Design a protein around this motif. Sequence first.
Motif, mmCIF file in Angstrom:
data_model
loop_
_atom_site.group_PDB
_atom_site.id
_atom_site.type_symbol
_atom_site.label_atom_id
_atom_site.label_comp_id
_atom_site.label_asym_id
_atom_site.label_seq_id
_atom_site.Cartn_x
_atom_site.Cartn_y
_atom_site.Cartn_z
ATOM 1 N N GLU A 80 1.271 0.632 -6.868
ATOM 2 C CA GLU A 80 2.616 1.210 -6.953
ATOM 3 C C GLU A 80 3.082 1.667 -5.551
ATOM 4 O OE1 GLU A 80 1.978 4.148 -10.212
ATOM 5 O OE2 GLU A 80 1.855 2.551 -11.688
ATOM 6 N N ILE A 81 2.197 2.321 -4.804
ATOM 7 C CA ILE A 81 2.520 2.741 -3.416
ATOM 8 C C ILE A 81 2.860 1.545 -2.497
ATOM 9 C CG2 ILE A 81 1.702 3.863 -1.277
ATOM 10 C CD1 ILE A 81 -0.057 5.647 -3.284
ATOM 11 N N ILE A 82 1.993 0.540 -2.505
ATOM 12 C CA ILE A 82 2.196 -0.705 -1.748
ATOM 13 C C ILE A 82 3.554 -1.336 -2.037
ATOM 14 C CG2 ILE A 82 1.385 -3.119 -1.458
ATOM 15 C CD1 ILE A 82 -1.509 -1.883 -1.996
ATOM 16 N N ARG A 83 3.963 -1.315 -3.303
ATOM 17 C CA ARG A 83 5.201 -1.977 -3.735
ATOM 18 C C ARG A 83 6.472 -1.185 -3.420
ATOM 19 N NH1 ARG A 83 2.132 -3.372 -8.584
ATOM 20 N NH2 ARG A 83 3.285 -1.629 -9.562
ATOM 21 N N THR A 84 6.352 0.137 -3.311
ATOM 22 C CA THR A 84 7.525 1.004 -3.220
ATOM 23 C C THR A 84 7.630 1.841 -1.925
ATOM 24 O OG1 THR A 84 6.439 2.751 -4.538
ATOM 25 C CG2 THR A 84 7.907 1.199 -5.769
ATOM 26 N N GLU A 85 6.507 2.140 -1.285
ATOM 27 C CA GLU A 85 6.516 3.041 -0.109
ATOM 28 C C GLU A 85 6.586 2.319 1.239
ATOM 29 O OE1 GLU A 85 6.516 6.612 -0.015
ATOM 30 O OE2 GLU A 85 6.979 6.263 -2.159
ATOM 31 N N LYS A 86 6.918 3.069 2.282
ATOM 32 C CA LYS A 86 7.027 2.545 3.652
ATOM 33 C C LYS A 86 6.297 3.436 4.635
ATOM 34 C CE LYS A 86 10.112 -0.752 2.854
ATOM 35 N NZ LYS A 86 9.688 -2.175 2.983
ATOM 36 N N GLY A 87 6.068 2.901 5.829
ATOM 37 C CA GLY A 87 5.532 3.685 6.940
ATOM 38 C C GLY A 87 4.063 4.046 6.788
ATOM 39 N N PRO A 88 3.645 5.161 7.426
ATOM 40 C CA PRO A 88 2.222 5.557 7.439
ATOM 41 C C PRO A 88 1.581 5.622 6.039
ATOM 42 C CG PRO A 88 3.513 6.920 9.010
ATOM 43 C CD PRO A 88 4.507 6.089 8.203
ATOM 44 N N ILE A 89 2.300 6.091 5.014
ATOM 45 C CA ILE A 89 1.712 6.185 3.664
ATOM 46 C C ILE A 89 1.482 4.795 3.057
ATOM 47 C CG2 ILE A 89 1.940 7.044 1.263
ATOM 48 C CD1 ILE A 89 1.409 9.073 3.687
ATOM 49 N N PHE A 90 2.444 3.893 3.251
ATOM 50 C CA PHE A 90 2.227 2.489 2.871
ATOM 51 C C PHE A 90 0.951 1.937 3.529
ATOM 52 C CE2 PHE A 90 2.183 -1.933 4.178
ATOM 53 C CZ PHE A 90 2.352 -2.596 2.969
ATOM 54 N N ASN A 91 0.779 2.167 4.830
ATOM 55 C CA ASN A 91 -0.352 1.596 5.553
ATOM 56 C C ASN A 91 -1.686 2.034 4.943
ATOM 57 O OD1 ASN A 91 1.384 0.295 7.362
ATOM 58 N ND2 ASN A 91 1.099 1.812 9.018
ATOM 59 N N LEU A 92 -1.753 3.298 4.537
ATOM 60 C CA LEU A 92 -2.940 3.876 3.909
ATOM 61 C C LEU A 92 -3.265 3.210 2.582
ATOM 62 C CD1 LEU A 92 -2.297 7.702 4.433
ATOM 63 C CD2 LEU A 92 -3.713 6.195 5.889
ATOM 64 N N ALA A 93 -2.306 3.160 1.656
ATOM 65 C CA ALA A 93 -2.538 2.487 0.381
ATOM 66 C C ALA A 93 -2.833 0.988 0.540
ATOM 67 C CB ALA A 93 -1.396 2.716 -0.590
ATOM 68 N N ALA A 94 -2.047 0.314 1.385
ATOM 69 C CA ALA A 94 -2.252 -1.106 1.672
ATOM 70 C C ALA A 94 -3.659 -1.398 2.187
ATOM 71 C CB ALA A 94 -1.195 -1.608 2.667
ATOM 72 N N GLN A 95 -4.107 -0.627 3.176
ATOM 73 C CA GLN A 95 -5.474 -0.764 3.682
ATOM 74 C C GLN A 95 -6.536 -0.463 2.636
ATOM 75 O OE1 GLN A 95 -5.137 -2.757 6.285
ATOM 76 N NE2 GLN A 95 -6.469 -1.563 7.630
ATOM 77 N N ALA A 130 -1.569 -3.574 8.381
ATOM 78 C CA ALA A 130 -1.884 -3.248 6.978
ATOM 79 C C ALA A 130 -1.055 -4.050 5.983
ATOM 80 C CB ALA A 130 -1.736 -1.770 6.711
ATOM 81 N N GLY A 131 -0.404 -5.121 6.458
ATOM 82 C CA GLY A 131 0.413 -5.978 5.577
ATOM 83 C C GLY A 131 -0.381 -6.443 4.371
#
Lengths: 197, 197
Positions: free
Chosen positions: A57-72, A145-146
């Motif tokens: 859900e984070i990967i799909r909806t969030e941006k920036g540093p928080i996205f990078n964390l969930a994505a990784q 973290a793409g």
Amino acid sequence: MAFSIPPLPWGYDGLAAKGISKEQVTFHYDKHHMGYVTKLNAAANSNPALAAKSVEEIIRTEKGPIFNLAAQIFNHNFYWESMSPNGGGEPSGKLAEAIRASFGSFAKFKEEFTNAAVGHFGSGWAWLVQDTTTKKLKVFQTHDAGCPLTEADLKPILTCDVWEHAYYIDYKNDRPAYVQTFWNVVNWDHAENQFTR
Amino acid sequence: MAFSIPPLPWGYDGLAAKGISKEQVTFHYDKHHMGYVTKLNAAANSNPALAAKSVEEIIRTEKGPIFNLAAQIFNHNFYWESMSPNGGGEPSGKLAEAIRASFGSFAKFKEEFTNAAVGHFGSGWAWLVQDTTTKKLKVFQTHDAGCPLTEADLKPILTCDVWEHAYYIDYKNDRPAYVQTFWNVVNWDHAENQFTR
Ligand SMILES: [Fe+3]
Ligand SMILES: [Fe+3]
């Protein structure tokens, strides 16, 4: 305590016999992979809404540093599952046929994936993904973290981490030798299950 | 054979007494830094026009992989010059005053640069640059092979490499500790000379 990651599928020393050492896996999982969880949990501590979201859900909806964390977090989870002490060789059944029908041959896929993993400049990830509309398999890179989950119609099948920390302890600068080791541990059981659903 | 790089200013083991080992410098220089040179020479082999361009000319005018190679050459050259077995502490004279006139104090500058270096996600570079129009100093980050020379009015003063290969041998995941070591080897003599012109 909002976020966690699954244990390594095969233990810290699980890939030592096939070219990824206990020390390499320990730093990568305990420091890098768990480090993202730690940072995400700190962000989540003051944001109940974020804490209630899945990593996907984070990967799909969030941006920036928080996205990078969930994505990784997701990328590393998928990476460990993409390897096995009983991995390597070629796949069989449905996936093997699909690889032929998308790439012409296993050798051609292996060439394209190697070229993507070895050629990626800076920090990133080499993927096998499926287009869920056309059903074609493709090699696909992400940088930093793409994550293919941000693309509507991409389903990840396999990944190899090519950030330098993935291989620096065992291989230093020699990412080609690391990628050759990836081919000896590649988990076709996991890939087949991803492909099938 | 078209491109070369200067030797290390202070030798392979030059920084070993101040926290960057012979091994770490050897892989960084012999494998990564020289690897760019080798790849650029291969591109230049078949292209006499490219072979006759300076690295800085390439940085300003070329795009894609060839840009990355030249920019990494420049950036690594600048990095070795940015450190010294006699470095560390604080600058004096004209640069020290300009740091105060741009950041309010050396401590503030150090905080900002450290935050940039430590906080950079994925592969990149922390720089002190001067704006040649306003004369002001700023902390400036580049990602991957990015180089301040692509912007018209930026003159580099110093750089710290924060690609994982720069510190992974000596520090593994601990980039903060590596950045603290950078502060112990920072070369104010090179910085001052870049500043004055
Ligand atoms: Fe990683
Ligand atoms: Fe470097």
